[PDB]
Write a protein that binds this ligand. Structure first.
Ligand SMILES: O=C(O)[C@H]1O[C@@H](O)[C@H](O)[C@@H](O)[C@H]1O
Ligand SMILES: [Cl-]
Length: 300
């Protein structure tokens, strides 16, 4: 029986996508393949789950490409701030040749990409004050995901970054040891972060695709007919998740606003973009070979 990893609560678009995937595989194989999605990160933190999947210990999962930068260096390109112009542009690129290049990089590291799930855009939330300019982040203690790029992002605005597993964030914000974090509206809402960090500032500074994927070890052990069933089910589940995502993004925004969060938009987006130049400079100085791939995205 397969085991699938999900970081999210059961009632979440990713979760429904993954369950639909597993249901379809079982249906189309006539019960020959069965499995279960394990929600709420119970089978590990995200970096550790990625390692399990590469090793064949975990059969499938939906992973943010954010933490995937350590195992699969090519994927760092999607974690660059403002690298995508919009979420629809992200779909176009990830479903096209740039996404195919990332798929090849993942395969080289033992991971078979079946589709790219939507995670919208990430924005800052905190318990201290609204963020309207990069200067507002100065001195702020901000949790980030496990990718060094994100540490650089926060430091470039004078903040103090702490890499921390997603499941630990709520308590750290609640008890006041980090001031805030950054995420899309469904994540901010579903985790109850919005109950303990009541300022949400729509910087939309990262758009990070997620990948429904399989362990290559598991995938390579399937019959050709099973492989085709898996690929089709993956595509169908991606279509479903993306549809659910749109609906949930609005629903979560409504919950956030009805819950008393002070939401502010960013008038001067240019200032945040300019503040991020050093993240690009640094990444490409440490990793010159990635220059062509980065331009494939940022110049699209
Ligand atoms: O901030 C985080 O750790 C989380 O952010 C969410 O937007 C993403 O869907 C999760 O996979 C995880 O990356
Ligand atoms: Cl995590």
């Amino acid at each position: 029986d397969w085991r699938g990893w999900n970081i999210h609560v059961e009632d979440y678009p990713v979760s429904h996508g993954m369950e639909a995937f597993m249901e379809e595989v079982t249906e189309k194989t006539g019960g020959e393949i069965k499995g279960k999605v394990f929600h709420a990160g119970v089978l590990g933190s995200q970096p550790d789950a990625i390692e399990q999947l590469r090793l064949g210990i975990m059969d499938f999962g939906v992973f943010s490409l954010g933490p995937m930068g350590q195992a699969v260096p090519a994927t760092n390109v999607v974690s660059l701030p403002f690298v995508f112009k919009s979420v629809p542009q992200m779909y176009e690129l990830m479903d096209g040749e740039p996404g195919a290049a990332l798929g090849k990089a993942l395969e080289e590291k033992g991971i078979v990409a079946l589709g790219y799930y939507d995670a919208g855009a990430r924005s800052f939330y905190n318990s201290v004050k609204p963020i309207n300019t990069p200067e507002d982040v100065q001195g702020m203690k901000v949790r980030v995901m496990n990718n060094d790029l994100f540490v650089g992002m926060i430091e470039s605005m004078g903040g103090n970054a702490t890499p921390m597993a997603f499941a630990e964030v709520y308590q750290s914000i609640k008890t006041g040891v980090v001031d805030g974090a950054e995420n899309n509206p469904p994540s901010y809402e579903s985790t109850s972060h919005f109950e303990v960090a009541k300022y949400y500032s729509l910087t939309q500074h990262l758009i990070i695709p997620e990948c429904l994927c399989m362990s290559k070890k598991t995938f390579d052990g399937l019959t050709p007919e099973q492989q085709e069933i898996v690929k089709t089910a993956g595509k169908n589940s991606t279509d479903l998740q993306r549809k659910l995502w749109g609906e949930r993004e609005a629903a979560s925004m409504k919950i956030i606003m009805d819950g008393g969060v002070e939401v502010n938009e960013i008038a001067d987006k240019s200032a945040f973009q300019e503040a991020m130049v050093p993240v690009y400079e640094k990444y490409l100085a440490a990793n010159p070979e990635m220059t062509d791939l980065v331009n494939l995205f940022r110049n699209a």
